[PDB]
Structure formats: structure tokens, C-alpha cells
Design a protein around this ligand. Structure first.
Ligand SMILES: Nc1nc2c(ncn2[C@@H]2O[C@H](COP(=O)(O)OP(=O)(O)OP(=O)(O)O)[C@@H](O)[C@H]2O)c(=O)[nH]1
Ligand SMILES: Nc1nc2c(ncn2[C@@H]2O[C@H](COP(=O)(O)OP(=O)(O)OP(=O)(O)O)[C@@H](O)[C@H]2O)c(=O)[nH]1
Ligand SMILES: Nc1nc2c(ncn2[C@@H]2O[C@H](COP(=O)(O)OP(=O)(O)OP(=O)(O)O)[C@@H](O)[C@H]2O)c(=O)[nH]1
Ligand SMILES: Nc1ncnc2c1ncn2[C@@H]1O[C@H](COP(=O)(O)OP(=O)(O)OP(=O)(O)O)[C@@H](O)[C@H]1O
Ligand SMILES: Nc1ncnc2c1ncn2[C@@H]1O[C@H](COP(=O)(O)OP(=O)(O)OP(=O)(O)O)[C@@H](O)[C@H]1O
Ligand SMILES: Nc1ncnc2c1ncn2[C@@H]1O[C@H](COP(=O)(O)OP(=O)(O)OP(=O)(O)O)[C@@H](O)[C@H]1O
Ligand SMILES: Nc1ccn([C@@H]2O[C@H](COP(=O)(O)OP(=O)(O)OP(=O)(O)O)[C@@H](O)[C@H]2O)c(=O)n1
Ligand SMILES: Nc1ccn([C@@H]2O[C@H](COP(=O)(O)OP(=O)(O)OP(=O)(O)O)[C@@H](O)[C@H]2O)c(=O)n1
Ligand SMILES: Nc1ccn([C@@H]2O[C@H](COP(=O)(O)OP(=O)(O)OP(=O)(O)O)[C@@H](O)[C@H]2O)c(=O)n1
Ligand SMILES: Nc1ccn([C@@H]2O[C@H](COP(=O)(O)OP(=O)(O)OP(=O)(O)O)[C@@H](O)[C@H]2O)c(=O)n1
Ligand SMILES: [Cl-]
Ligand SMILES: [Cl-]
Ligand SMILES: [Cl-]
Ligand SMILES: [Mg+2]
Ligand SMILES: [Mg+2]
Ligand SMILES: [Mg+2]
Ligand SMILES: [Mg+2]
Lengths: 247, 247, 62, 247
């Protein structure tokens, strides 16, 4: 047989490259996943991740209370935190024993998989009572924030999209919903009558994941990297695996 | 009057038979319910049931954590179980005091009502981090498992459909979503523009039920039988009520 | 060992000690107890008996 | 065939009678069990039973502390009861918050199976520090109390032997051991060199049972009667099953 890495007859080499290219392209086909991640960063260094994976379109919607830090099997000032919530929903509404709850997110990172169309991204960043823009009556239910998404790149390939905003001020008390549509460069409308019921089933079939990791290191090591997910850490380092035309 | 059960003038008899036939046929009409049940079986003999009832289409989607046994108002090793989850999401990821959590499901039974079209059934059986097939990039978001569904029959009538799979191995750690579409032998597409917004409202109107029963006996006696639900027990016994053309 | 002695006991942890008394009552006599579970996960799933090579296998009794 | 209960050809009848006679006689053979039961009666009506079943010989030995009432999974004044023990071992030895502990037995019933030789029964009824007769130096380690055992009879057959003594006084604080030898009307000594090692193995193989029942009714219904055990209740009623030459 020919010697490895010396000719066009390195079929193991050609198959390895097609294996990777097929994974990348399958993800971008209409048969592929579109994924979103919401990272809620807490002052104790811990991170709540919410992931949703689904065909055609995907989104996450969380209340103000849902995004607050929750330590499973540990104490969480549960009564005082009810009182904190009352004071966030209306100024001087509660009877809490603290000025600032360390359970409030300090920042949010939204990440989409590379199969999303960035022009379809929408976000409903509401106040603590889940109103998008001060009062319902003058509220547009979303903002198309695609222009703000940074490309997460590895070896010159886009492995994801990231929108990051800090919540460092006392008044940064939010409810949050985000949505993205899978790329579709064809003229076959996935929601037209022929396929609309598959999109309705996709709403049933979407898989969700939620967990609080103790640190960004732990998130990078045990969540991001093992699953070949894209990520952008605090030092602006990009994580992911480049697959198109690669061995 | 004619004597009972001796002539074609037994109107009480004819009405009883139409009453049953009408119930069976209403369920199969586009005005009827389509229902799914997910049974998570635990080693202590207890069973978590998740039911969803809705028009046109229906589904259930649960995380790995959501399917774990939860004893309401009792102790549940809540801190150790956070640690178990960490070790299931990534090997050697946690610091648990147990090798196998008895809260993990030992088996899953999926049951659909007889108004489903078995060819529309889809299942997204993912790993513990809610990825359908090892990595997102090469994941088809579902599998059409209709061929594997067994007919639950009573008096020769199909009262439901059942897909059962055990999870007896240490590596059987899953996230699970299932979806089915109501039968529609007509050419009126329930999701075409005329009726699509009724299908969107059906997503709002779907009713969910969830409860942990202490034993299969208790499930059969107090959940299945009182509500005329179909079921298949561990001894392969079929439960349900035959209604078409019956008194 | 008694039936109770072979049941799982987690030292320094919770063990449903009251419910497990009730489990025992229902194992000693059918419908004898008032437990909140069908099967106790504390019951052994298997037993392995091992003897050293100095035993005479013909003298083993169980 | 002959008609039932009318001739010597009722083989079902003859086999039923041999079945019972064989059970009775097997128990009395050297291949059979010899059994002892110790019933500790508490003022709250509850009863601790200790049973031992073994070949050739059998006995039970309990400390003063071991015979005290223990409510599994409930509160038991565990610290005060340590203090009670100190005051029972030596007068004014402890710092308890009670004059009389309701955990102390109010009475003891010793019952042997009908396969025992009543002349071999021995009891070591010691004080609270496990000394049989005031001081070790003048203590015979047992008393042969066989003459005091009453025959438990059912249908004129001996189904067991009972020795009952109440402990109604403040000073009735005991440690207790009892032993009985299986009947052996032959001249084959079960402990002679030919069979001595089988007797040593019988010490390893003896099965023990211990449980606290809530009432004598409960003991009679769920312990005594289901297992065909002999018993004598507070109203002097005999329980057991007559088996010799019976259908
Ligand atoms: N600036 C400001 N924003 C408020 C206040 N109360 C509510 N908001 C909301 O908070 C959002 C702005 O938050 P930030 O961007 O963190 O505030 P900022 O003043 O721009 O401060 P920097 O972004 O850190 O420069 C707005 O879109 C408002 O909807 C307030 O008192 N001051
Ligand atoms: N067999 C196997 N499956 C694994 C392993 N790890 C994860 N899996 C997943 O588990 C699923 C198979 O589970 P099972 O069907 O219970 O395993 P099995 O080897 O077929 O064993 P049996 O069904 O009991 O005969 C696969 O579809 C994989 O996605 C593993 O180590 N061995
Ligand atoms: N009588 C008596 N027995 C004691 C005393 N202290 C210890 N004992 C022991 O208790 C045993 C006797 O107990 P009981 O038979 O209940 O006492 P009793 O005086 O005969 O009273 P009754 O049997 O109810 O008539 C004796 O064998 C002693 O070993 C004591 O102060 N008085
Ligand atoms: N929408 C897309 N989806 C998948 N790949 C894309 C997309 N747009 C561009 N690319 C490809 O990704 C690679 C990087 O192009 P990109 O435009 O991201 O890089 P750039 O021009 O160096 O940086 P930027 O545009 O961020 O300033 C190229 O191979 C490009 O063809
Ligand atoms: N898709 C359906 N929905 C409702 N009833 C059906 C459906 N298909 C068949 N039936 C009816 O249900 C009854 C049973 O038919 P079915 O095919 O289930 O039985 P079978 O041929 O004996 O067994 P099987 O097909 O499982 O080997 C018949 O009256 C049949 O007409
Ligand atoms: N040691 C024994 N073991 C088994 N059965 C015995 C024993 N001694 C006597 N029996 C038998 O048990 C039955 C009852 O005899 P037992 O002597 O117990 O009755 P009794 O003379 O009426 O009353 P008691 O002797 O108590 O005053 C008889 O069939 C007798 O042969
Ligand atoms: N603003 C507050 C906060 C707390 N408390 C009291 O302090 C007790 C303990 O506080 P809690 O907020 O419940 O915290 P933990 O019990 O420490 O934590 P968790 O409840 O999450 O286990 C509460 O029961 C509550 O009665 C209160 O009166 N007023
Ligand atoms: N891997 C583990 C498991 C438990 N623990 C400790 O043991 C205590 C009790 O265990 P937990 O898992 O909380 O179980 P329970 O309190 O018995 O039950 P629940 O919390 O569900 O009421 C916890 O607070 C935790 O500090 C621990 O340190 N490390
Ligand atoms: N069949 C049962 C089981 C439990 N309980 C009550 O629930 C309480 C807690 O249950 P228990 O069985 O004692 O478990 P834990 O306290 O969690 O564990 P342990 O006792 O082993 O520390 C008990 O005090 C008991 O009163 C009950 O009434 N009936
Ligand atoms: N003579 C005594 C008896 C009790 N106590 C105190 O009272 C507390 C509770 O009494 P205890 O005897 O332990 O009874 P419970 O806790 O009610 O029951 P248990 O310990 O059996 O669960 C103990 O911790 C002990 O410090 C004491 O100081 N002196
Ligand atoms: Cl495609
Ligand atoms: Cl219709
Ligand atoms: Cl013999
Ligand atoms: Mg706890
Ligand atoms: Mg609290
Ligand atoms: Mg307890
Ligand atoms: Mg105590």
C-alpha cells in the first residue's frame, strides 16, 4: 500500500476529513440541531447554565426568580430571598435583611451554535415583573440583537455566536427570553403547511439542560470541552472544535 | 313495550352502544384529545407518571434530573444527589457517597392514546446533558420509533400504544422527549393557515399531570383504571376499556 | 445474620429508620406493616459466600 | 373409587395424617430443630421477642440493657436511659430524671418447642451487672428450672413448654440467659467425638430473630399463629397446632 501522508491514496486521511466535514454540514442542514445557552454568572464564581437543543428553532425563557442562584442541598436564605423578590418587584415592597442579594446574576452570556441564522436572533430582556419595555402597552416583545453577537472562532472557523452583557448595577434586575432560528438558505419554508406540524413536534421534542457549576474553570473542563460546545471565557479566550474540511 | 334483549326495539340497548361508539369516535376526530404518558419506574417499586393531554399533537420533555425519583415531604439526599448529577454529566465529575443512585429510572414506558397516528411518533432519547446522539453536530433531533410500539388491546380493540425500554445498566443515564400527532386521515391540514393559530393555542391549552405512585398496583388501581386509561403492566397484562360498537 | 442485620445501613447518614421498622413488619407477615414503599432498596440484591482454601468443601452448611 | 370418609381406601385421608405425623416426628428426631423464645413484656403493651432455632441445643443470652424497650425510628430518652442504667448497676450511681424506666421489662416468658428435653433446661437469671447469684464467687452459673415449665397443649397434644415470671417490683432488674437441649432418647451422644464437630457447626448455624411487636394481639396474630409457634397469652389461653396422628 502507499505510505501514509505521502499520496492521494491516503484513504484513512480522506475519510477522517469527510467525517469532520459531514458533522459540520449535518448540523447546518435542516435535519440538524440549533442550540442556545444562557450563562448566568454569580458573585461567588459559580455559573448557572441553561441549554436548549432543538430542530428548526430554539429558545430559553426565564423569570427574574429562576435566574437567581440556587445551591442544591445547601441553605439559600429561602425566606429572606422571598422578601428580596418583593423588594425587586416594587421598590420598598419587601422586608429583607440585605441591600443586595448575592444570588442575583452579575452577568449573562448568550451563546448560539453555528447552525443559527444570526439575523433571526431575538431577545426579550424585561424588568423583574417580566415586562419587556417599562409598560406592556408600549412594549415591543423582543429586540433583534444579532448585530451585537461576536463570532466565536477556532482555527479560523465560526464555532458559535456570543452576546455578553454584565449586570453590575443595583438596578440590573431582569427577566430574560432569547430565541434563534436554524439557518435556512433554501426557499423551502420549514413552517409552511407541508412541514408546520414537524415544527410543532419540534416544540415538544426540544431537550433542555440546567445545572449550576462552581466555577468558569469547571464549566470549561466538564461542560464545554467534553461536549465540543463553543464558549468565550472572561479572558476573551475562544473554545470549540473546528470541523469543516479538517482532520 | 317489547321485552328487553329480544328485539330491534331495545332503544336503551341501541343508545348504550351509540354512547360508547360516540366516545371512541369523538376521541379520533380532529376535535378530540391526543395523549401521551411517560412512566419512570424506580427500584423501590414506585412510579413517576407524566401525562400530557392536548388537541392535534402532544409531547413530554424531561431532563435527566427531572426523571430522577423525588419523594415529596421526605428526605432525598438532595446534596449527595447534586454530586451524583455532577458525576453523571461528566465521569468523575462529582463527589458523591454512592456508586449508583436508586433515584435513577430502571425503566421507561411510553404510552399513547388510540387517537395518535403511530407513524408520527418521535423520540429524542439523549444523554445526561440533553444531547440526542453523542454530539450536537451529528445529532438528528429525534428517531421515529413507531414500528416498536405494541398495541394495547382489550376485547380485540386497540386502546393504546406502548413502547417500553429498561435502563438496567450503569451507563443508562438519559434525558427524554417524546411527541405524537393526533390521527388525521383527511386532507385538511390542521396546521395549514386556516387552523395554525388553533394549533398554537393548543400548545397553551395542553394539560399536564405529574405524580409519583408507590407501586404498579397503586398506579393500576388509582390512576389507570379510574380514568379509563390504557396500560401494560410488568406481567404483560393489558388494561383499558373497549368502546367501539360495544355496550 | 438475621433478615434485619443483612439490610443496608449507612453509618452517619439517614436510613428511613422508622419506615424501615414498618418495612420489616410487612416482610415478617404480608400486610403486617404500614411502610411508605413497595420495595426497600436496603434489601440485599445478591449474596456471595466465600471460603478460604483451608476449608473442606464437603463440610460446608448453610 | 371408594367414597371419601367411608373406608380404609381413603388414601388422601391417610396421606394427610402421615404428613402431619411426619412433621411432628421429624422435629423430635436428631435431624430436627430445638427452639427457644424469650418474650420481654413492656408496660406500654409492647413485646420484644427473641427467638433462636438450632439443631441439638439452643439458647439466648441478653444483658440488662438489651432487654430494655427500644422503639426503632422513634425517640427513646437515650441519654436519660444511659443515666438510668448507671443507677440500676449501682444504687445512686446515675443522674436520671425518672424513678422507674418504662423501658424495663414487666415480665418474661420463656417458651421452648416440644422437641426440647425439659430436664435439660437451664437458666442464668442474673442481676443488672450479669452476675447469676449476688457475687461471682458463690454463683452457680445456672439453675435447672424444668420443673416450673407448664405444658402448652392443643387438642391434648404438647405443642411447647412455658416458664413465666413477672418483674413487677422496683428491684426486679435482671440479665438473662436460657438454654435447652434437643430430646435424645437414644444412646448416641450427639456431642461424642463422631458428631461433636456437627454440634460446633450448629453453634454457627443457629438462626436468631428479634423484633418488638406493639401488642400481645399483634404477636398472636402476626408472629405466633402464622408460623405455627406455641404460645400462652395473659388470659392463660394456649396457642399452637396439634400434629401427631392428626388430619
Ligand atoms: N441607566 C439606568 N438604567 C436603568 C435604570 N433603571 C432601570 N434601568 C434599565 O437598565 C438598562 C441599562 O443598564 P446598564 O446598561 O447596566 O446601565 P448604564 O447606565 O448604561 O451603565 P453602563 O452600561 O455600565 O455604562 C436600561 O436599558 C434600563 O431599561 C436606571 O436607574 N439607570
Ligand atoms: N452498550 C453500551 N451502550 C452505551 C454505553 N454508553 C452509552 N451507551 C448508550 O446506551 C444505549 C444502549 O443501551 P442498552 O440497550 O441498555 O445497552 P445494550 O449493550 O444493548 O444491553 P442490552 O440492551 O441489555 O442487551 C446506546 O444507544 C448508547 O447510546 C456503553 O458503554 N455500552
Ligand atoms: N424479695 C426481694 N428480692 C430481691 C431484692 N433485691 C433483689 N432481689 C432479687 O429478686 C428476686 C425475687 O424477686 P420477686 O420474686 O419478684 O420478689 P418477691 O419478694 O418474692 O415478691 P413476689 O414474687 O411478687 O411475691 C430474688 O431471687 C433476689 O435475687 C429485694 O430487695 N427483695
Ligand atoms: N454565516 C456564516 N456561517 C458559516 N460560515 C461563515 C458564515 N459567514 C462566513 N463564514 C465563513 O467562516 C469563515 C470566517 O469568515 P468571517 O467573516 O467570520 O471572518 P473574517 O472576515 O476574518 O472576520 P469577521 O467577518 O468577523 O471580521 C470563512 O471561511 C467564511 O466563508
Ligand atoms: N390504525 C388503527 N386505528 C384504530 N383501529 C385500527 C387501526 N388499525 C387497525 N385497527 C382496527 O383494530 C382492530 C384490530 O386490528 P389489528 O391489526 O390491531 O389486529 P390483528 O391483525 O389481530 O393484530 P396485529 O395487527 O397486531 O398483528 C380491527 O378492528 C382493526 O380494523
Ligand atoms: N415428654 C413428652 N414428649 C412428647 N409427648 C409426651 C411427653 N410426655 C408425655 N407425652 C404425651 O403427650 C400427651 C399428654 O400427656 P401429659 O402427661 O402431658 O398429659 P396429662 O397427664 O393429661 O397432663 P399432665 O401430665 O400435664 O398432668 C400424651 O399423649 C403423652 O403420651
Ligand atoms: N427577612 C427575614 C429573613 C429571615 N427571617 C427568619 O429567619 C429564619 C431563617 O431564614 P431563611 O431565610 O429561611 O434562611 P435559612 O433557613 O438559613 O435557609 P433555607 O431556608 O434556604 O434553608 C426564617 O425561617 C425566617 O423566619 C425573617 O423573619 N425575616
Ligand atoms: N457527597 C456528600 C453528601 C452529603 N454531604 C453532607 O451530608 C449532609 C446531609 O446530606 P443530604 O445529601 O443533604 O441528605 P439529607 O439532608 O438526608 O436529605 P434532604 O437534603 O433531601 O432533606 C449534607 O448537608 C451535606 O453537607 C456531603 O458533605 N457530601
Ligand atoms: N411509614 C412511615 C414512615 C415514616 N413516618 C414518619 O416520618 C418521619 C421521618 O421518617 P424516618 O423513617 O425516621 O426517616 P429519617 O428520619 O429520614 O431517617 P433516620 O430516621 O434513619 O435518621 C418519622 O419520624 C416518622 O414519624 C411515618 O409516620 N410512617
Ligand atoms: N438525665 C438527663 C437526661 C437528659 N438530659 C438532656 O436532655 C437531652 C434530650 O434527652 P435524651 O435523653 O437524649 O432524649 P431524646 O433526645 O428525647 O431521645 P433520643 O435521644 O432517644 O432520640 C439530652 O441530649 C441530654 O443532654 C440531661 O441532661 N440529663
Ligand atoms: Cl436539509
Ligand atoms: Cl373532525
Ligand atoms: Cl434421628
Ligand atoms: Mg439535606
Ligand atoms: Mg429557612
Ligand atoms: Mg428518623
Ligand atoms: Mg437524644
Amino acid at each position: 500500500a502507499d505510505v501514509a501522508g505521502t499520496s492521494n491514496r491516503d484513504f484513512r486521511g480522506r475519510e477522517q476529513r469527510l467525517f469532520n466535514s459531514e458533522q459540520y454540514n449535518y448540523n447546518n442542514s435542516l435535519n440538524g440541531e440549533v442550540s442556545v445557552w444562557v450563562y448566568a454568572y454569580y458573585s461567588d464564581g459559580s455559573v448557572l447554565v441553561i441549554n436548549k437543543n432543538s430542530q428548526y428553532k430554539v429558545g430559553i425563557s426565564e423569570t427574574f426568580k429562576a435566574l437567581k442562584e440556587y445551591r442544591e442541598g445547601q441553605h439559600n436564605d429561602s425566606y429572606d430571598e422571598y422578601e428580596v423578590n418583593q423588594s425587586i418587584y416594587y421598590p420598598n415592597g419587601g422586608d429583607a435583611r440585605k441591600f443586595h442579594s448575592n444570588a442575583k446574576p452579575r452577568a449573562i452570556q448568550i451563546i448560539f451554535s453555528p447552525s443559527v441564522n444570526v439575523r433571526t436572533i431575538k431577545m426579550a430582556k424585561g424588568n423583574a415583573v417580566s415586562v419587556p419595555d417599562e409598560y406592556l402597552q408600549r412594549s415591543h416583545p423582543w429586540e433583534a440583537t444579532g448585530i451585537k453577537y461576536r463570532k466565536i472562532k477556532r482555527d479560523g472557523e465560526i464555532v458559535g455566536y456570543s452576546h455578553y452583557f454584565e449586570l453590575p448595577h443595583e438596578y440590573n434586575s431582569i427577566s430574560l427570553a432569547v430565541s434563534g432560528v436554524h439557518k435556512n438558505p433554501s426557499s423551502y419554508n420549514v413552517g409552511s403547511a407541508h412541514n408546520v406540524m414537524d415544527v410543532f413536534q419540534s416544540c415538544d421534542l426540544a431537550l433542555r439542560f440546567c445545572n449550576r457549576y462552581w466555577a468558569e474553570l469547571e464549566l470549561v473542563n466538564h461542560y464545554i470541552s467534553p461536549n465540543a460546545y463553543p464558549y468565550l471565557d472572561i479572558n476573551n479566550h475562544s473554545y470549540g472544535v473546528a470541523l469543516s474540511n479538517r482532520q
